[PDB]
Design an enzyme around this catalytic site. Structure first.
Site, PDB file in Angstrom:
ATOM      1  N   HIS A  65      77.818  51.650  65.645  1.00 34.16           N
ATOM      2  CA  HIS A  65      77.732  52.335  66.917  1.00 34.16           C
ATOM      3  C   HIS A  65      78.997  52.048  67.707  1.00 34.16           C
ATOM      4  O   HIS A  65      79.200  50.934  68.212  1.00 34.16           O
ATOM      5  CB  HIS A  65      76.496  51.867  67.678  1.00 34.16           C
ATOM      6  CG  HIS A  65      76.095  52.762  68.798  1.00 34.16           C
ATOM      7  ND1 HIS A  65      76.885  53.804  69.251  1.00 34.16           N
ATOM      8  CD2 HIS A  65      74.981  52.765  69.573  1.00 34.16           C
ATOM      9  CE1 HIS A  65      76.270  54.401  70.264  1.00 34.16           C
ATOM     10  NE2 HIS A  65      75.116  53.790  70.475  1.00 34.16           N
TER      11      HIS A  65
ATOM     12  N   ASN B  17      77.141  55.835  80.409  1.00 33.60           N
ATOM     13  CA  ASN B  17      77.512  54.429  80.526  1.00 33.60           C
ATOM     14  C   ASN B  17      78.926  54.245  81.054  1.00 33.60           C
ATOM     15  O   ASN B  17      79.576  53.228  80.797  1.00 33.60           O
ATOM     16  CB  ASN B  17      77.293  53.686  79.196  1.00 33.60           C
ATOM     17  CG  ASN B  17      75.859  53.174  79.050  1.00 33.60           C
ATOM     18  OD1 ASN B  17      75.221  52.802  80.032  1.00 33.60           O
ATOM     19  ND2 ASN B  17      75.357  53.136  77.829  1.00 33.60           N
TER      20      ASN B  17
ATOM     21  N   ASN C 194      78.649  56.333  73.022  1.00 34.28           N
ATOM     22  CA  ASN C 194      77.716  56.347  74.165  1.00 34.28           C
ATOM     23  C   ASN C 194      77.935  55.188  75.149  1.00 34.28           C
ATOM     24  O   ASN C 194      77.000  54.759  75.844  1.00 34.28           O
ATOM     25  CB  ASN C 194      76.272  56.349  73.676  1.00 34.28           C
ATOM     26  CG  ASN C 194      75.958  57.523  72.762  1.00 34.28           C
ATOM     27  OD1 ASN C 194      76.491  58.610  72.913  1.00 34.28           O
ATOM     28  ND2 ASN C 194      75.030  57.312  71.842  1.00 34.28           N
TER      29      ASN C 194
HETATM   30  C1  LIG Z   1      65.310  58.401  73.906  1.00 30.96           C
HETATM   31  C2  LIG Z   1      66.698  58.441  73.275  1.00 30.96           C
HETATM   32  C3  LIG Z   1      67.146  57.321  72.595  1.00 30.96           C
HETATM   33  C4  LIG Z   1      68.412  57.325  71.971  1.00 30.96           C
HETATM   34  N1  LIG Z   1      68.875  56.204  71.311  1.00 30.96           N
HETATM   35  C5  LIG Z   1      70.104  56.173  70.709  1.00 30.96           C
HETATM   36  C6  LIG Z   1      70.525  55.041  69.999  1.00 30.96           C
HETATM   37  O1  LIG Z   1      69.847  54.003  69.836  1.00 30.96           O
HETATM   38  N2  LIG Z   1      71.772  55.068  69.464  1.00 30.96           N
HETATM   39  C7  LIG Z   1      72.591  56.180  69.536  1.00 30.96           C
HETATM   40  O2  LIG Z   1      73.699  56.162  69.020  1.00 30.96           O
HETATM   41  N3  LIG Z   1      72.173  57.299  70.204  1.00 30.96           N
HETATM   42  C8  LIG Z   1      70.922  57.298  70.800  1.00 30.96           C
HETATM   43  N4  LIG Z   1      70.507  58.419  71.497  1.00 30.96           N
HETATM   44  C9  LIG Z   1      71.387  59.655  71.538  1.00 30.96           C
HETATM   45  C10 LIG Z   1      70.920  60.598  70.383  1.00 30.96           C
HETATM   46  O3  LIG Z   1      71.115  60.048  69.066  1.00 30.96           O
HETATM   47  C11 LIG Z   1      71.596  61.973  70.444  1.00 30.96           C
HETATM   48  O4  LIG Z   1      72.986  61.809  70.234  1.00 30.96           O
HETATM   49  C12 LIG Z   1      71.355  62.721  71.778  1.00 30.96           C
HETATM   50  O5  LIG Z   1      69.984  62.537  72.166  1.00 30.96           O
HETATM   51  C13 LIG Z   1      71.662  64.219  71.741  1.00 30.96           C
HETATM   52  O6  LIG Z   1      71.006  64.804  70.654  1.00 30.96           O
HETATM   53  P1  LIG Z   1      69.752  65.780  70.879  1.00 30.96           P
HETATM   54  O7  LIG Z   1      69.979  66.895  71.840  1.00 30.96           O
HETATM   55  O8  LIG Z   1      69.278  66.341  69.547  1.00 30.96           O
HETATM   56  O9  LIG Z   1      68.632  64.845  71.380  1.00 30.96           O
HETATM   57  C14 LIG Z   1      69.241  58.436  72.069  1.00 30.96           C
HETATM   58  C15 LIG Z   1      68.793  59.551  72.772  1.00 30.96           C
HETATM   59  C16 LIG Z   1      67.540  59.563  73.370  1.00 30.96           C
HETATM   60  C17 LIG Z   1      67.178  60.828  74.088  1.00 30.96           C
HETATM   61  O1  LIG Z   2      67.930  55.085  75.433  1.00 31.57           O
HETATM   62  C1  LIG Z   2      68.765  55.914  75.262  1.00 31.57           C
HETATM   63  C2  LIG Z   2      70.012  55.602  74.422  1.00 31.57           C
HETATM   64  C3  LIG Z   2      71.058  56.515  74.461  1.00 31.57           C
HETATM   65  C4  LIG Z   2      72.213  56.304  73.743  1.00 31.57           C
HETATM   66  C5  LIG Z   2      72.328  55.179  72.961  1.00 31.57           C
HETATM   67  O2  LIG Z   2      73.489  54.960  72.249  1.00 31.57           O
HETATM   68  C6  LIG Z   2      71.320  54.245  72.914  1.00 31.57           C
HETATM   69  C7  LIG Z   2      70.151  54.450  73.650  1.00 31.57           C
END
Ligand SMILES: Cc1cc2nc3c(=O)[nH]c(=O)nc-3n(C[C@H](O)[C@H](O)[C@H](O)COP(=O)(O)O)c2cc1C
Ligand SMILES: O=Cc1ccc(O)cc1
Ligand code: NA
Length: 396
Positions: A191, A251, A194
């Site tokens: 990772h 962030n 984000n």
């Molecule tokens: C509830 C939630 C938890 C997420 N947790 C992570 C995470 O642990 N690590 C990460 O790299 N991205 C995390 N993301 C970002 C997602 O992997 C993704 O990049 C983002 O939600 C956009 O994709 P989508 O429109 O299909 O949801 C999270 C997003 C949401 C909404």
């Molecule tokens: O909880 C949301 C979330 C979003 C991006 C991340 O990388 C990890 C967690």
């Protein structure tokens, strides 16, 4: 209930349902479950949920040949600060991860552990409780004045990483990667996106250092590329992917408003391709799209319109996973998977659709997701989203 305004399109006839090799794995289709933090891990010890997590992952692995990337998983105590997210540094953690990986492999799908370190996104007061530092690239910048206040209130002010600190994170990544692979994971994803710790070193807003880890493009990329190299050499490049979010502002990252941001990410990708040309190609690069600059905003909000991830394709020649508001836009996916090395990550609608792959294949309606159970300690909103057939057995 189903998403009301949604007109599904069947994608059975596209490259989304063509197999592809990713590292050591052999996928049947290119719909990927990306990392999703759900906070079902138990405290103390950041232990994966023993009741529900293997069920949750197994449900979403149900289509054979599915690639699953776990929720962010802490590499070490110092890398964490969220009591209900999992780690993979300890024997007790690995004990439950083996069962989760077994549940995914029982479906003939694959599991990749996203290795996580929080940096300035952590909780200074939780860290202080545990005798841990509040870590960052440069202590002259905070995310916001609130985290600055809580930092001072906990007597745990930001700590600019020393070179020795960095070396210890690299050791913890190696340790957590080795535990992941011994537990049965098919690979790991670093990772670096984000706005978490590695992204904080890449970004010129958070990184104001003047040693070899900041001040230039090359220096800001150094921490991420040292983690890459450490894992290439311990578990192999085909067991390692990297996640990046060039346009993200989540962030407190710069995003496209920083005109130098494409050069920063172009340098990382160029360095990955150089390694590939010397025989060490990472399994994939996973990009978050400008379609979603902040995942705390609903679909269609926070869409950055003045930049694209197309640059990445001219530099990196391996598989690319793209993620960000694709579930509701099959017309965009249809276009983008014409490229034969592109996969699509589906985040929020994989939360709500355990059989999402089938629904994409057949063009079926999608379950709405419930944002209030994204992070609750509950099976509700985790393992009780119905499959399509169950949804029709319920009136939806
Ligand atoms: C509830 C939630 C938890 C997420 N947790 C992570 C995470 O642990 N690590 C990460 O790299 N991205 C995390 N993301 C970002 C997602 O992997 C993704 O990049 C983002 O939600 C956009 O994709 P989508 O429109 O299909 O949801 C999270 C997003 C949401 C909404
Ligand atoms: O909880 C949301 C979330 C979003 C991006 C991340 O990388 C990890 C967690
Ligand atoms: Na170990």
């Amino acid at each position: 209930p189903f998403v009301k305004g949604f007109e599904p399109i069947s994608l059975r006839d596209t490259n989304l349902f063509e197999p592809i090799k990713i590292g050591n794995t052999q996928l049947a289709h290119r719909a990927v479950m990306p990392p999703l933090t759900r906070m079902r891990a138990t405290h103390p010890g950041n232990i994966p949920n023993k009741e529900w997590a293997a069920v949750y992952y197994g449900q979403r692995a149900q289509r054979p040949g599915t690639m699953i990337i776990t929720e962010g998983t802490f590499i070490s105590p110092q890398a964490g600060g969220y009591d209900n997210a999992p780690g993979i540094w300890s024997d007790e953690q690995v004990a439950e991860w083996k069962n989760i990986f077994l549940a995914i492999h029982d479906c003939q799908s694959f599991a990749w552990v996203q290795l996580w370190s929080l940096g300035w996104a952590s909780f200074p007061d939780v860290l202080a409780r545990d005798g841990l530092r509040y870590d960052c690239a440069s202590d002259r910048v905070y995310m916001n004045a609130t985290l600055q206040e809580k930092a001072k209130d906990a007597n745990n002010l930001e700590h600019s990483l020393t070179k020795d600190d960095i070396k210890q994170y690299i050791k913890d990544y190696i340790h957590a990667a080795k535990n992941s692979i011994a537990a049965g994971a098919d690979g790991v994803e670093i990772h670096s996106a984000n706005g978490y710790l590695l992204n904080q070193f890449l970004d010129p807003h958070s990184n104001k250092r003047t040693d070899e880890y900041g001040g230039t493009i090359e220096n800001r990329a150094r921490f991420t590329l040292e983690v890459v190299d450490a894992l290439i050499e311990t578990i192999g490049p085909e067991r390692v992917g990297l996640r990046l979010s060039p346009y993200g502002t989540f962030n407190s990252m710069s995003g496209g408003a920083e005109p130098g941001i494409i050069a920063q990410y172009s340098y990382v990708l160029g360095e990955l391709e150089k390694r590939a040309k010397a025989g060490k190609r990472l399994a994939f690069v996973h990009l978050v799209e400008p379609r979603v600059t902040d995942p705390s905003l609903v679909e269609g909000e926070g869409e950055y319109s003045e930049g694209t991830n197309d640059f990445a394709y001219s530099i990196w020649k391996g598989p690319i996973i793209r993620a960000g508001n694709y579930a509701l836009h099959p017309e965009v996916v249809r276009e983008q998977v014409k490229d034969p090395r592109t996969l699509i990550g589906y985040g929020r609608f994989f939360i709500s659709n355990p059989d999402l792959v089938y629904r994409l294949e057949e063009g079926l309606p999608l379950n709405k997701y419930d944002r209030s159970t994204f992070y609750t300690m509950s099976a509700e909103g985790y393992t009780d989203y119905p499959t399509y057939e169950e949804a029709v057995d319920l009136g939806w």
